[PDB]
Amino acid sequence: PVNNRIQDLTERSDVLRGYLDYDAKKERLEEVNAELEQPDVWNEPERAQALGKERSSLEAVVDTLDQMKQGLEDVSGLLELAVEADDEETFNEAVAELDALEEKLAQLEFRRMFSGEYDSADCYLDIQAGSGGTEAQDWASMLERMYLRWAESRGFKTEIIEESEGEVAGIKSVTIKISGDYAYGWLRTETGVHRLVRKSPFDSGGRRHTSFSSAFVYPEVDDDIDIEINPADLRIDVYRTSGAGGQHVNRTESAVRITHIPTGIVTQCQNDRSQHKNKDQAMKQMKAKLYELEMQKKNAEKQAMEDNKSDIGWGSQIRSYVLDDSRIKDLRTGVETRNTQAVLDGSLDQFIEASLK
Amino acid sequence: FVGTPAGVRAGGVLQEIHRDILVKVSPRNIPEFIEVDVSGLEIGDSLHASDLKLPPGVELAVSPEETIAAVVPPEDVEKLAEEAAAEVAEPEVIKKGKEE
Amino acid sequence: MLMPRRMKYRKQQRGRLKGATKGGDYVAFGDYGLVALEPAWITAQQIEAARVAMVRHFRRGGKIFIRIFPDKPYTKKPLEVRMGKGKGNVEGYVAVVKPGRVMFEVAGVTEEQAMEALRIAGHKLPIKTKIVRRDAYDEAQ
RNA sequence: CGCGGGGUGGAGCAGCCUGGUAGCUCGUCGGGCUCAUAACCCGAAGGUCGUCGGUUCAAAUCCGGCCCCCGCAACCA
RNA sequence: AAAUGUAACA
RNA sequence: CGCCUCCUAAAAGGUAACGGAGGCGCCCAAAGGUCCCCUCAGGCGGGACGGAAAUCCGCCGGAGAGCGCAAGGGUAGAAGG
Ligand SMILES: [Mg+2]
Ligand SMILES: [Mg+2]
Ligand SMILES: [Mg+2]
Ligand SMILES: [Mg+2]
Ligand SMILES: [Mg+2]
Ligand SMILES: [Mg+2]
Ligand SMILES: [Mg+2]
Ligand SMILES: [Mg+2]
Ligand SMILES: [Mg+2]
Ligand SMILES: [Mg+2]
Ligand SMILES: [Mg+2]
Ligand SMILES: [Mg+2]
Ligand SMILES: [Mg+2]
Ligand SMILES: [Mg+2]
Ligand SMILES: [Mg+2]
Ligand SMILES: [Mg+2]
Ligand SMILES: [Mg+2]
Ligand SMILES: [Mg+2]
Ligand SMILES: [Mg+2]
Ligand SMILES: [Mg+2]
Ligand SMILES: [Mg+2]
Ligand SMILES: [Mg+2]
Ligand SMILES: [Mg+2]
Ligand SMILES: [Mg+2]
Ligand SMILES: [Mg+2]
Ligand SMILES: [Mg+2]
Ligand SMILES: [Mg+2]
Ligand SMILES: [Mg+2]
Ligand SMILES: [Mg+2]
Ligand SMILES: [Mg+2]
Secondary structure, three states: OOHHHHHHHOOOOOOHHHHOOHHHHHHHHHHHHHHOOOOOOOOOHHHHHHHHHHHHHHHOOHHHHHHHHHHHHOOOOOOOOOOOOOOOHHHHOOOOOOOOHHHHHHHHOOOOOOOOOOOOOOEEEEEEOOOOOHHHHHHHHHHHHHHHHHHHOOOOEEEEEEEEEOOOOOEEEEEEEEEOOOHHHHHHOOOEEEEEEEEOOOOOOOOEEEEEEEEEEEOOOOOOOOOOOOOOOEEEEEEOOOOOOOHHHHOOOOEEEEEEOOOOOEEEEOOOOOHHHHHHHHHHHHHHHHHHHHHHHHHHHHHHHHOOOOOOOOOOOOEEOOOOOOOEEEOOOOOEEOOHHHHOOOOOHHHHHHHOO | OEOOOHHHHOOOEEEEOOOOOOEEOOHHHOOOOOOOEOOOOOOOOEEEHHHOOOOOOOEEOOOOOOEEEEEEOOOEHHHHHHHHHOOOOOOEEOOOOOOO | OOOOOEEOOOOOOOOOOOOOOOOOOOOOOOOEEEEEOOOEEEEHHHHHHHHHHHHHHHOEOOEEEEOOOOOEEEEEOOOOOOOOOOOOEEEEEEEEEOOOOEEEEEEOOOHHHHHHHHHHHHHOOOOOEEEEEOOHHHHOO
16 A cells, blocks of 8 residues: 555656746756856855855755655665565564655645745635626535635634625625644635636526636735834924914914824914923824825725726636536646535645645 | 752752751750751742751751742843833722721 | 822822932842932933833843832823813823832843843933942842 | 724624623525526524633633734924 | 606617 | 821931822611620632622631721721621
């Protein structure tokens, strides 16, 4: 039963050679070993440091794949060197071997997921209906069920934050917290518009219809916009008010103006008579105005997302659920599972694992 | 205190609660010290006057329950952060009158 | 930082700083101690700054004992009100310290470490201080 | 800073003053009608009463302190 | 006295 | 804004400030008079419903309970039941 598990360590390791490109990185590795090889290469060591750190960046690829074809091959000869001599220690000592290379290959599979800043934060899934309407709101509810059963069959927590059910039948939108480990790595390769070509049940004479719904996926940040006001950067002017007051207002510097230096935000207050009532008030107004800019930043980045976020429309898609000839196709890598109502059960691993290249 | 506590090896501190012990003894019979083996103490274990091996003619004058030595966790900068961001509930005033 | 968890009274008259310490004048726990040479109200701020200075010098190891504690509420009226209209608001708390008191006390630490840490802690305090180590005079108390 | 009014299920309000008992409407959930949805009909679930402390035998309720909310006032130079 | 049913009829 | 209690008040009394804290504008026909009798809170153990705390049993106990309501003083050799 053991040589079936070498059969698989050679399977994930070959298309691991595909996106890593041993063929395109055994090449680049050589003229960095050539540039750094002539004695003048520590001439502007910025040039040098990037390449010696590159060199193991490519020798964790080239030479790690070089210990997978030699290593597995000295595993499969030692486990036949234990069957035909009845030597059971040559087969515990060629299995302690298969537990070591099952990690150098596990480590090399975290070039799929260890490359995305924060691919570990408890991410959120933002599903939306789309073209079509009732049909697509049905398909939207189908697709939340799909990712819920997915997340349960993967150790995530199925945590639903916000729903809104559609008025005919189904869901217009949903947001789930996929509270789990490394959750963003898996579900970010699920971002896209899921077309569902399908056969439709809401159309009277039973016509074949297309309806789309999207899945957008993001991680979790600090979401704290409470910047502290530090006196290193506030310049506070004091001067006289401009209206009524008497020998006062004239003869007293009651008005204050606080200007945040790096921003250029200015603020005044003249409302009361004490400069400290006014210095108080202008500190408030100055707090709130930098609370409104840091607001304007965040919304600005959000609108940058929204306007760069597809449209859930015709020809904007990634999948077929042609349930009238039983396929589900991911036009992007692209695979073709034929066991359709097994995908809705949560076999997304298929597409995901191959889509992380 | 003979021996180096194993808690000390783990980074702890030997707090010497008593550096001497109260005792009834003859003037002809005064010992110079009394040894105590603290090498077995972790963080945070403790020794008591009951654990004292006493020499002949000397007789413990405090309660055997009296603690003599303890090994305590060290001072650590990794904690400062939590202690700085630790918020304190403002002091409650004990009620008086129709407020008890 | 340090303050009473609860109290019978919120506010407290100022009193006065006459004489040497009532007690706590001898090293009672650690190996060395920082003794006050002149009287003052030591704020909880100052105590905490001294403590953090010492643990931040020890980095890891040692044991600090703080033997003063601010139970005396400090009061101040809101800025630019006039005299009268009641006693000010509680703004912080202080520990009453008089000449001769062992304020801080360190153990589990070499002599140069204790000397240096207690010195730096002394710079965080509003009074002149003096570094002492445990004596037979201390033990006899 | 002042005066006095509030905080009670998912939402909006009632309950306090003369303490023991938290109610109404919408919503939510299960069932019906319909080919289906809404509407309607039947049944159900749902509240640390802002916090700390505590008046009393007993607190949503009474009395202090803090915390957010709303209104008013902040004058004569 | 009582609302509505989109989007791919050979 | 009058009255009561405590502190500030510097060991007689008294003593101010828009000083620090709380109460009063009632109540009881017994919660009053006098005789007689009784002793608390709490802790530990035991014990059907039965709990931290109902009542019961035992042991430990000078008063930390109670004395209608604030506080103080007083108080079981009673002012308490
Ligand atoms: Mg003008
Ligand atoms: Mg002027
Ligand atoms: Mg002026
Ligand atoms: Mg099926
Ligand atoms: Mg004074
Ligand atoms: Mg004093
Ligand atoms: Mg000061
Ligand atoms: Mg003051
Ligand atoms: Mg003024
Ligand atoms: Mg005043
Ligand atoms: Mg003041
Ligand atoms: Mg202060
Ligand atoms: Mg002192
Ligand atoms: Mg100093
Ligand atoms: Mg003493
Ligand atoms: Mg006028
Ligand atoms: Mg007096
Ligand atoms: Mg007096
Ligand atoms: Mg007097
Ligand atoms: Mg006098
Ligand atoms: Mg007189
Ligand atoms: Mg009053
Ligand atoms: Mg009677
Ligand atoms: Mg009678
Ligand atoms: Mg009893
Ligand atoms: Mg019992
Ligand atoms: Mg029972
Ligand atoms: Mg019982
Ligand atoms: Mg009493
Ligand atoms: Mg009362």
